[PDB]
């Protein structure tokens, strides 16, 4: 499923992925850790640190600064275990709250971040963070759009229709942005 | 197959995401 590596990266940019600053928080150079789409096909633990810290920070702020206080940036190995045990438990809780909608989190996926098994966990993680923010930034009069999105529809015509509504909304709202900033 | 309706639901997700994100800022910007 190539689009899984695709939508992920797009969804990565959806959270506002800026490869520079998010590499700057770790105190390391970009040239030694490549970002983008073709970054997790092989074992790549640095990109793992970066994307996982950004993904955990985008969803939570205070508890994220708490559980990753004695870990990040995990430059050494004694403090690395702290990161690997603080992230695995959280991902296990998240997977248990959703269940079949998530791949079962295994600590072994964190010993070598790469291959399709890591990309699967990463895409479902990105989906979860998107959704739990569609749960908070969408209006109280529109929270159902979240659960309407959790409703796993199976027919293609309704999927077409839903995309259709959303894309006309997209066009109109981007047009209103121009009206507001210019007028 | 399912992979295409998942593509559709994902793109709907992204539309909804970015739209709400720019709405919450434009409402702030107009006031």
């Amino acid at each position: 499923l190539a689009w899984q590596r695709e939508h992920m990266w797009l969804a990565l940019q959806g959270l506002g992925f800026e490869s520079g600053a998010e590499a700057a928080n770790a105190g390391k150079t970009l040239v030694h850790v490549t970002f983008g789409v073709n970054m997790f096909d092989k074992p790549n633990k640095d990109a793992f640190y970066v994307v996982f810290h950004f993904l955990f920070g985008k969803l939570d702020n205070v508890r994220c600064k708490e559980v990753f206080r004695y870990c990040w940036p995990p430059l050494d190995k004694k403090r690395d275990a702290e990161f690997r045990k603080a992230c695995c438990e959280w991902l296990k809780k998240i997977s248990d709250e959703v269940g079949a909608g998530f791949p079962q989190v295994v600590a072994s996926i964190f010993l070598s971040p790469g291959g399709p098994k890591f990309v699967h966990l990463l895409y479902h993680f990105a989906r979860y963070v998107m959704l739990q923010h569609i749960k908070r930034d969408a209006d109280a009069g529109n929270v159902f759009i979240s659960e309407a999105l959790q409703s796993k529809i199976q027919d293609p015509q309704k999927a077409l229709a839903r995309n259709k509504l959303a894309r006309q909304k997209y066009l109109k709202v981007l047009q209103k942005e121009n009206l507001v900033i210019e007028e | 197959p399912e992979d295409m309706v998942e593509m559709i639901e994902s793109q709907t997700l992204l539309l909804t995401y970015l739209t709400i994100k720019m709405q919450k800022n434009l409402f702030r910007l107009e006031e």
């Binding site: 997209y170 066009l171 | 559709i8």
Partner: peptide, 19 residues
């Protein structure tokens, strides 16, 4: 469906590039 897909993703990536 692929046409709406393409228009979608293109508008997504290009609007993301707006400052």
């Amino acid at each position: 469906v692929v046409t709406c897909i393409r228009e979608n993703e293109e508008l997504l990536k290009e609007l993301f590039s707006s400052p």
